Amino acid sequence: GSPDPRAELDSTVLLTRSLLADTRQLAAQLRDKFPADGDHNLDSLPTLAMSAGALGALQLPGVLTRLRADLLSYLRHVQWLRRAGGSSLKTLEPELGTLQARLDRLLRRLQLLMSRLALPQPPPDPPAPPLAPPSSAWGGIRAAHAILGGLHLTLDWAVRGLLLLKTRL
Ligand SMILES: [Cl-]
């Protein structure tokens, strides 16, 4: 029947925490084999907003819309890594593909949450062009660090933001 938004956010946060843990584990596996010297970034990745000062009902549609968009970008990047990241990263399977499938599940859950709560849906956006292949094997490894680290941060701020917002529902 009418969903309880608090319970729905609780459920969504639990699944986000699961994906956060998977992402953290894969990032540490990657650093064990290919250590990183510096925080790595990629221009094609979303800029994370890190909103959590004061969040309430008015902000919920926007937070969820932005999360959906960000997670879809991370999915594109994860798929790109698996296909074109270079042989150096074949060792990250099958875990990277499992992460991809779980990200898909969370994306489905977010669209359903928005539908059941009758929240305004984003306009069908123009899909981003293909990602260029890495310019080198080490460039591909740095991109993997950037992708897993950025996904981790996105999921951490989603957990934080959604739980804070829930306190005002
Ligand atoms: Cl399920």
Swiss-Prot record:
Localization of this protein: Secreted
Molecular function via GO: cytokine activity; growth factor activity; interleukin-11 receptor binding
Marked site positions, Important for interaction with IL6ST and for the stimulation of cell proliferation: W138
GO BP terms in the entry: B cell differentiation; cell population proliferation; fat cell differentiation; interleukin-11-mediated signaling pathway; megakaryocyte differentiation; negative regulation of hormone secretion; positive regulation of cell population proliferation; positive regulation of MAPK cascade
One GO cellular component, as annotated: extracellular space
Keywords recorded for this protein, A-Z: Cytokine, Growth factor, Pharmaceutical, Secreted, Signal
Residue stretches in coiled coil: none
Region (Important for interaction with IL11RA and for the stimulation of cell proliferation): 152-160
Subunit structure comment from the entry: Interacts with IL11RA to associate with IL6ST, giving rise to a multimeric signaling complex.
Function: Cytokine that stimulates the proliferation of hematopoietic stem cells and megakaryocyte progenitor cells and induces megakaryocyte maturation resulting in increased platelet production. Also promotes the proliferation of hepatocytes in response to liver damage. Binding to its receptor formed by IL6ST and IL11RA activates a signaling cascade that promotes cell proliferation. Signaling leads to the activation of intracellular protein kinases and the phosphorylation of STAT3.
Family: Belongs to the IL-6 superfamily.
Protein name per the record: Interleukin-11
Species this chain originates from: Homo sapiens (Human)
Encoding gene per record: IL11
Residue range from the parent sequence: 32 to 199 of 199
